[PDB]
Amino acid sequence: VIPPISCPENEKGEFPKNLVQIKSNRDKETKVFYSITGQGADKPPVGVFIIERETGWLKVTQPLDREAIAKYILYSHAVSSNGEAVEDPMEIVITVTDQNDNRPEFTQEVFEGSVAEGAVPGTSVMKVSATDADDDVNTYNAAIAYTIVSQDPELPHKNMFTVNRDTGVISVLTSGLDRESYPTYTLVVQAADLQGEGLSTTAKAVITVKD
Amino acid sequence: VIPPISCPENEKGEFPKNLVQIKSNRDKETKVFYSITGQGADKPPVGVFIIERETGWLKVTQPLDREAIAKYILYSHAVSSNGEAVEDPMEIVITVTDQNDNRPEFTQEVFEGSVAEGAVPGTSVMKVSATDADDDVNTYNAAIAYTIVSQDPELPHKNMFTVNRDTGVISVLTSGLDRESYPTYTLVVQAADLQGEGLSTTAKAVITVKD
Ligand SMILES: [Ca+2]
Ligand SMILES: [Ca+2]
Ligand SMILES: [Ca+2]
Ligand SMILES: [Ca+2]
Ligand SMILES: [Ca+2]
Ligand SMILES: [Ca+2]
Ligand SMILES: [Hg+2]
Ligand SMILES: [Hg+2]
């Protein structure tokens, strides 16, 4: 039988690239010709994978995309020169492994929230959220951390609020909200993967100060 | 025989993680017990890879790091309950695949250069350099793009210099350099992987205007 095969997405260099060599024992009693079927082979997407009919070498012809197709299920066939299948079709599972090629994406471009000016420091205000198309199950490529990039106006001073880097919940950090002088605040928030050390994106959070 | 084995670095989840099942046809004649040898198995680093003596499942016991060890070479053994090896040791090559977990780093914290004030626009001044520890052969995780982040001072005007994104060579972009007015310039340069779209780092290029 053939064991599982893995290939990293976004591979660069020259193609095609060798994956594994399929071989039938009957090769010693007859000339055998190899073929593959399945989505990724003879079915759309066609030709992503190919196999040399005489050598039995399975190959990949282009860079892969885990976010497009993360797993291919193919079937190899072995037929003798006489026209008879010398083996029962063998299943081949090709797993596409992940690369951090997607920046997180906030669920909204502008999040809205409000807070009473007398709110004691530590009061939760609102929550922002971002997703990441990468592999959050097997890697850290989609492990998001939230941070506040800027505040406008920066009065009475900067850091009027803060954000929980895990939950995206924004809270009152200090006292001093003054609806009369600074009615609203526009915060630029950031979401970055690799636990905050990777790719990032930003969005806005507009907070209205109530009485 | 065993096909190539690959495993991505920095994997998360519960360990051990299955890789492949090894079996001996000799089991038909007697009970067989499997084991592995090699650096990464019984020899340092000990226990990175283990094998179930009865089922033959080769497993990985911890997250790997391509920048430390990118390839392991082990050997599987198959011994009968009577004490006789029923197969010759089989070589297993385990390839560690890359993840973009290293940001580029400039070869110097501050690069120094000089240029005569009469220099015509388009004159090469100096060069800045950065390296990236990731896989530059199989991925774009180490493909660097250079850019200028800021210019101090921003006089006589902004864009006095420019940098080739591929080579890192800094050139005179516009005319107006005069040491009598502004003798030195401090540029913040940035190097980012994934061809400029990934992880980034910065440094400074100090340029001195001469007569
Ligand atoms: Ca992708
Ligand atoms: Ca990806
Ligand atoms: Ca990501
Ligand atoms: Ca590493
Ligand atoms: Ca890198
Ligand atoms: Ca790496
Ligand atoms: Hg591959
Ligand atoms: Hg693995």
Side-chain angles (χ1 to χ4, degrees), chain B residues 59-89:
Chain B
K59 313 181 189 297
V60 58
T61 72
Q62 58 185 245
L64 289 340
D65 177 18
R66 199 204 63 86
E67 283 73 49
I69 302 175
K71 182 185 185 176
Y72 296 84
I73 290 183
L74 309 178
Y75 276 81
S76 55
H77 305 260
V79 181
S80 55
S81 56
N82 67 76
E84 299 294 280
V86 302
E87 301 264 17
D88 286 292

Side-chain angles (χ1 to χ4, degrees), chain B residues 9-10 65-67 98-102 133-135 141:
Chain B
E9 67 171 327
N10 305 341
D65 177 18
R66 199 204 63 86
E67 283 73 49
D98 197 52
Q99 280 293 334
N100 196 6
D101 60 337
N102 286 279
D134 296 312
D135 197 351
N141 300 342

